[PDB]
Amino acid sequence: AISIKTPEDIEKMRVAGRLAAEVLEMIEPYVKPGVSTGELDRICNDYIVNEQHAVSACLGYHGYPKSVCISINEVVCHGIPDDAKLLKDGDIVNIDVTVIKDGFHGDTSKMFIVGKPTIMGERLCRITQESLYLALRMVKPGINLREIGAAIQKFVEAEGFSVVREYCGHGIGQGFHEEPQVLHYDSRETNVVLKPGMTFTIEPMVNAGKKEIRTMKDGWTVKTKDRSLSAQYEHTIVVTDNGCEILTLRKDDTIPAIISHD
Ligand code: MET
Ligand SMILES: [Co+2]
Ligand SMILES: [Co+2]
Ligand code: NA
């Protein structure tokens, strides 16, 4: 059941993708020491609803109570925004946004460094983004997803970090999480050949320490087992005839929006 988007579908995804990217571009100036994650969530929500006239796909999903996911430091993913959680100098934080517009989803995330960065945090964020970019450069019709997961893993590991196994990229479109599962590591279980019109996300979570993770009692928050820092970046893409197009590209991305192979 891997859905192939029509040209019309892709046009709608381009819109939803840009909206999502825009939320991330917009929030930047607000990310400073002393701000709470609860406030960031409110600002995002307002923008999405009142300015963009869109909807957050997260709010209510399986009961998720907020509009975006904000994961600080050792929180891997799904961090829940809260008025009591204040950002400090040196924190690294991921803001993951998924917007729905005209029934199509746009899913993307990036890391932000609060105030003065630490050596580890900067490095970790950089390597994580680079691992995503590497993956994007490989995307093209005919290739097996497995190769992509394997490349990410090799890269990350060579740099002294680890890749989280449990969470993965996913198809996306009218549905939030569609087939297929996009693994960020090498697995003999993976056997999917890419074809034009497929749309999915790549969103590697990398840990400064060991790969092990743990789910909190809240049922959402995921943290590293060894409390090391964790970083993630995400983009939604569409496979094209000779490469791919990045639907959630932002002003700060340093990769071209269209990647062509020849
Ligand atoms: C708690 S919903 C998490 C969704 C997230 N935006 C993803 O990439 O799947
Ligand atoms: Co996401
Ligand atoms: Co995603
Ligand atoms: Na984090």
Cis peptide before 180 (omega within 30 of 0): yes
234 is in an annotated binding site: yes
In this structure, are residues 97 and 176 in contact, taking their beta carbons and an 8 Å threshold?
no
- Structure determination method: X-ray
- Report the SS3 class of residue 92: strand
Deposited resolution, Å: 1.8
> Exposed (0-12), middle (13-18) or buried (19+): which is 43, by Cβ within 10 Å?
middle
Q: Which amino acid is at 236?
A: T
d(CA 167, CA 183): 8
79/25 Cα distance (integer angstroms): 20
Q: Please give the helix or strand (H or E) that residue 15 lies within, else none.
A: helix 7-27
Q: Is 107 in the pocket of ligand 1 (CB under 6 A)?
A: yes
Q: Compute the distance from residue 72 Cα to the ligand 4 centre, in Å.
A: 4
Atom of ligand 1 nearest to the CA of 77: 3
Closest protein CA for atom 9 of ligand 1: 177
Residue 108: what residue type? T
CATH of 1-262, picked from 3.90.230.10, 3.40.50.1000, 3.40.605.10, 3.40.220.10, is 3.90.230.10
- How far apart CA 149 and CA 103 sit, in angstroms, is 29
What amino acid occupies position 180?
P
Buried b (16+ CB within 10 A) or exposed e, 14-36: bbbbbbbbbbbeebeeebeeeeb
Helix axes 7-27, 37-46, angle to 10 degrees: 140
CA-CA distance, 199 to 246, in Å (whole number)?
10
